[PDB]
Design a protein around this ligand. Structure first.
Ligand SMILES: OC[C@H]1O[C@@H](O)[C@H](O)[C@@H](O)[C@@H]1O
Ligand SMILES: OC[C@H]1O[C@@H](O)[C@H](O)[C@@H](O)[C@@H]1O
Ligand SMILES: [K+]
Ligand SMILES: [K+]
Lengths: 822, 822
């Protein structure tokens, strides 16, 4: 069951009905200004930070969903409709929405008028541009009046939604019907006071009329679908004082049969220097210079099209670093287009703002942004470098870190908790990924403060030492890392014991003492502490590196001695020292995270995939049997059916959802990668297909959410809603799947001194070529793959056999031809 | 222009159209369970705390406003309509809503079916009951199906609105079609975990069908006005699993010509002891015992009626303490009914939850709850006593206090700022009003902790000494109290200097040092420091009292010497010692707060109203001339037209709104009482009329909000919206106008040892009788009033002339007849 299709040549998803199972969105912008845009034009835009500089208003949990966005009401002879279908819901003769890379087009046609709108954020601009084309598709002349509409937000979205007792009296606007390229409205709430910024909403023509007051435009007792002004056929020229500012312009157009007209609208974010905020000595009238310039840069359709083409070229350039040509078109569209596009979006948004995350409490996550770096470092290495510096600046001197930072200020906060003991090790992961990718060893010398404190700077390498030493100096009675508030699983809260309702487990005070340990952080420390040992040796720190290898070896042996349940890895020891994730308990017998992570770290790996005695194989077979479903692998089994006070948030979810028996997709690639490590390519690829957008498109009515991006959670087998996704777009699933498919399944993966070429994908992809740009040289990697279990590659390079699977990096400008036989 | 009228005999405001300027609400409940109910059935319900235990969901800033509430969709022959008008907006043949004391009735009739709903919260119950009467007003038999609807909230209203990434997976219900009294739906989100509470929505009949999933009942792409289930005419029997739980039952009705049927619906809040939460050993099925009991208590019309009658008797008893019979029916309905009812609501709700206050950030305000006591102590003194202990327990040992407390827990928080230096003295005000009303001197001996700390208890009197000593030990260089974060005016933030956008002025950190002083707090200290001295005297503390009256004299002298601008009182000195509220400045020349409060404290009062040399008279004349408008007295003049960094939030409002040139009604009664003190009753009464609901009903189209309650803010003369109110219901204006009218205009006011009878109302009310129950005796107070300027009363009591205007309190059971000549 499908509601659209991929168009690979156009790099677009084509939605051919308004009647999708859920609003399906795109993100516009890749730099500092972003828009959430549904296939019904719903959503909102913000500059840098969705909580603090939100330009336009959007209602989550509206009835119906997604009533509110950038609308264009058409009044043709008294009949009013919107080409986005919502909010008016007039019958359309034709409707299509295409979501592309950084832009979308939505086109609706009714009664001989076709209205197509291109929405995008241009490169280098803090603005959302709309190019609207109206065409008379009838055989007689048409006259229609077009009313644009956007509802402003009062910048601080939390305040906007809660503090009406103040903010119903502060809404301010200016209206400029006769500006230099057409008509503009200025939304300038609090520019009177501390804000140096305002929004503009303008059109490239002298508008017939305007509206800036929502209640006037919409009318008492009316929804957006029933707005009075478009039904009247003329603007009310309303000038807001408080209440709800909007931007709306009316333009009447007359079109002969076949004739079209373009109109260009811009929503822009402008700043002025404090000294130049005002046009007038009395400080009453905003300085419009930068808004006039912006509108000048988008006064013509030619300017729009040039900017859209520059954006297309930017995307071609980004996607030129890693591409695959295989016999599986679903695989190829994920690797070449969709998974990389999503990794840009997660890089920019972290978990902050989607149609599920509300752009309020969540900023840039310390763990989240590190995981997203793993799937982003090849796309724009300079920006990954900057992100590493920003994240490491929010770390404390003892190696612990703020769990997230505020995007606008880059300062850490505790708003979604403190003391997540996996956080410090993710910094080592992010840096190791970045150095392997770029060979930029010099980043280890970058001075980086602790908690943004001027003069506290130490080299970024020393931050990694603090991370490493934090785990070393925080192990429990089994030699396993103490878990703290939680590890990667935010709902495994072993120090909590909360009996007070409604207090967030994420922020609630934890109990000192106890002996609670995490098998997940143990594996994480084996995996990434090995990379820290390597960086130390490369830095000429021989003794630090020897010591680091020793501690890694200790923790590794502890996993096998104290972290093994018999047929799978234990999950943890709780506050009392009792095992969690043991077959000795009735529920939560096996938990997926240490199964994938321990095996990625090589723990329990035997002689080959057919070595039934190896703990890794036993562990992965137990995952397959106990956690496997057609939709992916669930987090634990059985799910908990009553509240387990000593485990925290996890048992508070009904079984089959989120952390209690949901398919929590971020941890599935760990098992995929683990499967590649033991030599079971076919099984690893199977798990990849079960959760991957292009493979799940044919069950779009089950998945419900966007068929072109990963989501955080698919309901698991214990849910009545099994198969149904929540929380699309913003998830570490995107980066980790890209890691899994690009580096482990397809097998092309940067190491410090050469490119590892190690396919392990099984027999469903028997022939493919990867084109990989790495360290300035292009590698054409032609793979002939039997897919036989445990079979690993041999290579020839430029006509000559090479030993093993690592190709030493060639000099920049080379074309290196690698022939791979598996 | 009116949209309804007062019905005095019924104690109701009758709304005769759905098409009001704004939603007009009532509050149901007076104990621990409260509903906000508009004349369109919109709003929500909560137990004790609107942030933490909110039963049902309501959207502020919805389009249209107030789409959402307790709906009953009637399907007659395929035609669907709701008697509340919204959300369907079908043409009704008749519509009326009556808001009463603790109940409302909303009736709509269409095509031969009349549907009346009585909504109320019964005494002693944590539930909202609706008795629905449907009548066939046609001459032929009718059939219809009625579908009830309410949307649940996930208890924590903040989480409900912002934390979808967790909470879309936690919604849980149970469905009981065949229970003891009829059908019931249980909303039990998080009862699996830490909540010992669930909600029930039931009806006293076996429903034909039900729905618990919003998306199924409403249908995809639909608003509530388009709900699919009522249109199809059959329930979908949906059982929610996450997403959006609701309660809906369908009931088929059949009616002969002229026949009616009653249906009783109950939304209830139930708790179980932890040990009895579950019906089953597996802990999956909630114990329904308390809900079954509740539903049996409201299984019949007879039970509903008995309970509504008990509620009516309760209100007649509450209102028997103070009433007036005069020549002015507008004055009488305010004093007798509406102002007292509003005082009950502000006592219960503080500033927490209205159609403007969102029931999230604001709990029970320390200042607000003390001002509310002034207008509530005569209603239920035992409940006032307890509130005093509650508030005083959140005070710190140094006499400063948390600015508010969380209603559920009674623990103070800083969520809306700290260090408001008027707060400590408001506690003296509250206790003095309480003791004058009740003669309960023993409250001063009650053990009360500081910040709820076990073992920190000291007598309540000692808390007052901490408050009094706080001001004494925190005066600035002119002998005036240091202002701290702000005084009563929350936007006068002299220690702020914020240049950072979107950091609340209320909570942002303040700068140490400086010399910022408040003339407001100086006047509050002179007024209430005198009360504290009298309490110390009655306790035999002659040293303490003598020293107290000394400091009162020093501050009074400081006001005259350093707080006087020439024709009015100064407002403040800023951080650098520069005067605020001086004719020397271009804007904010005169501010109303010290003019009212200084003169209330007797500061600057001369020989009589025509003593034109007296500072009090010059100050009051300046108020009249510079701040007077037809709608009330604005806060200051001119309003500030640019941001003044040294003054904090105040100049961030556009001129004419809130604290920047708005009519901030709470401060108007201070000027009214001031004018009574100086002997100008005619002017005091004029100001009272200008802001008083019964008098502004005839301009309902200008005031906009409820015509039967005070609001916090009416737009001032500098606003394009001059005359239009915001923030109705929840305001200190209610208590302080009750004080003004009952105690100063009408002149009947308790003092420690007798009842003062001192009318000062001017010639427009030439005779009236007050009936006042005080200390167990009833005083029948018959006034003949010339209104002569400055003329004050002489009294005869029970046939004998008495000296002065204070009647010593008579023994309990007495009827004391007081004859008053003015
Ligand atoms: O914190 C509540 C305070 O908020 C300020 O923004 C408003 O101007 C005040 O009227 C209000 O009392
Ligand atoms: O604070 C963010 C966290 O909130 C928890 O309630 C959820 O279960 C987690 O998946 C999410 O990461
Ligand atoms: K997590
Ligand atoms: K205030």
């Amino acid at each position: 069951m499908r509601y659209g299709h991929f168009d690979d040549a156009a790099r677009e998803y084509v939605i051919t009905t308004p009647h999708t199972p859920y609003p399906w969105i795109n993100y516009l912008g890749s730099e500092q200004f972003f828009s959430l845009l549904s296939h019904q034009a719903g959503g909102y835009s913000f500059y840098r930070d969705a909580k603090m500089r939100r330009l336009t208003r959007y209602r989550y949990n509206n009835i119906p969903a997604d009533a509110g966005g950038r609308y264009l009401y058409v009044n043709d002879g008294g009949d009013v409709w919107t080409p986005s279908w919502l909010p008016v819901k007039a019958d359309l003769d034709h409707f299509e929405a295409r979501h592309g890379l950084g832009y979308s087009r939505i086109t609706g046609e009714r009664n001989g008028l076709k209205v197509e709108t291109l929405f995008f954020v241009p490169l280098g601009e803090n603005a959302e541009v709309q190019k609207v084309t109206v065409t008379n598709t009838s055989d007689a002349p048409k006259t229609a009046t077009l009313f644009s509409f956007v509802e402003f937000c009062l910048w601080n979205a939390q305040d906007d939604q809660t503090n009406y007792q103040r903010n119903l009296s502060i809404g301010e606007v200016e209206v400029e019907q006769d500006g230099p390229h057409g008509s503009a409205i200025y939304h300038k709430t609090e520019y009177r006071e501390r804000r140096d910024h305002y929004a503009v909403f303008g059109v490239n023509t002298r508008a017939d009329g305007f509206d800036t007051d929502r209640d006037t435009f919409v009318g008492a007792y009316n929804s957006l679908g029933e707005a009075s002004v478009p039904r009247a056929g003329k603007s009310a020229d309303s000038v807001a004082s408080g209440w709800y500012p909007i931007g709306s312009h009316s333009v009447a157009v007359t079109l002969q049969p076949g004739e079209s007209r373009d109109l260009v609208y811009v929503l822009g974010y402008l700043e002025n220097p404090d000294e130049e905020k005002w046009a007038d000595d009395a400080h009453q009238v905003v300085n419009k210079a930068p808004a006039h310039a912006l509108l000048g840069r988008f006064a013509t359709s030619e300017q729009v099209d040039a900017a859209l083409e520059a954006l297309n070229s930017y995307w071609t350039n980004l996607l030129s670093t890693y591409s695959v040509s295989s016999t599986d078109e679903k695989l190829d569209r994920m690797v070449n287009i969709w998974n990389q596009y999503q990794c840009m979006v997660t890089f920019n948004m972290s978990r902050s703002a989607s149609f599920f995350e509300t752009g309020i409490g969540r900023g840039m996550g310390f763990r989240d942004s590190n995981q997203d770096l793993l799937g982003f470092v090849h796309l724009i290495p300079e920006r990954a470098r900057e992100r590493i510096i920003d994240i490491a600046s929010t770390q404390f001197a003892d190696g612990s870190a703020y769990h997230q930072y505020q995007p606008l200020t880059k300062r850490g906060n505790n708003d979604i908790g403190s003391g997540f003991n996996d956080d410090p090790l993710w910094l080592i992961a992010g840096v190791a990924a970045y150095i392997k990718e770029s060979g930029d060893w010099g980043i280890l010398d970058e001075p980086v403060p602790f908690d943004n404190e001027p003069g506290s700077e130490v080299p970024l390498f020393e931050h990694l030492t603090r991370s490493f030493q934090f785990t070393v100096q925080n192990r429990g009675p089994h030699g396993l890392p103490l878990i703290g508030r939680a590890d990667w699983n935010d709902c495994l809260n072993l120090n909590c014991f909360s009996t007070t309702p409604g207090e967030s487990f994420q922020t609630t005070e934890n109990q000192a003492g106890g002996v609670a340990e995490s098998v997940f952080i143990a594996a994480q420390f084996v995996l990434y502490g090995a990379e820290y040992a390597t960086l130390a040796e490369r830095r000429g720190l021989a003794d630090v590196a020897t010591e680091a290898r020793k501690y890694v070896d200790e923790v590794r042996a502890a996993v096998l001695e104290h972290g093994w349940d018999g047929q799978w890895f234990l999950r943890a020891y709780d506050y009392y020292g009792n095992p969690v994730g043991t077959d000795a308990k009735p529920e939560g017998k096996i938990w997926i995270e240490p199964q994938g992570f321990a095996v990625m770290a090589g723990i329990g790996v035997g002689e080959g995939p057919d070595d039934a005695d190896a703990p890794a194989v036993k562990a992965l077979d137990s995952v397959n049997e106990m956690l496997g479903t057609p939709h992916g692998l669930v987090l634990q089994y059985p799910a908990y059916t009553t509240y387990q006070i000593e485990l925290g948030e996890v048992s508070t979810y009904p079984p089959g959802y989120k952390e209690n028996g949901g398919i929590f997709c971020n941890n599935n690639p760990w098992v995929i990668i683990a499967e590649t490590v033991v030599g079971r390519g076919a099984q690893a690829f199977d798990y990849y297909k079960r959760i991957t957008p292009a493979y799940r498109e044919d069950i779009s009515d089950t998945h419900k959410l966007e068929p072109y991006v990963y989501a955080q959670m698919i309901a698991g087998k214990e849910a009545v809603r099994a198969g149904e996704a929540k929380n699309s777009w913003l998830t570490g699933t995107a980066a980790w799947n890209f890691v899994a498919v690009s580096q482990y399944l397809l097998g092309v993966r940067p190491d410090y001194d050469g490119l590892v070429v190690d396919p392990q994908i099984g027999p469903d992809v028997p022939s493919y070529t990867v084109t990989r740009v790495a360290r300035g040289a292009t590698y054409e990697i032609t793979v002939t793959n039997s897919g036989a279990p445990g079979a690993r590659a041999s290579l020839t390079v430029d006509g000559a056999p090479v030993d093993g699977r690592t190709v030493p990096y060639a000099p920049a400008g080379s074309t290196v031809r690698v022939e791979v036989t598996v």
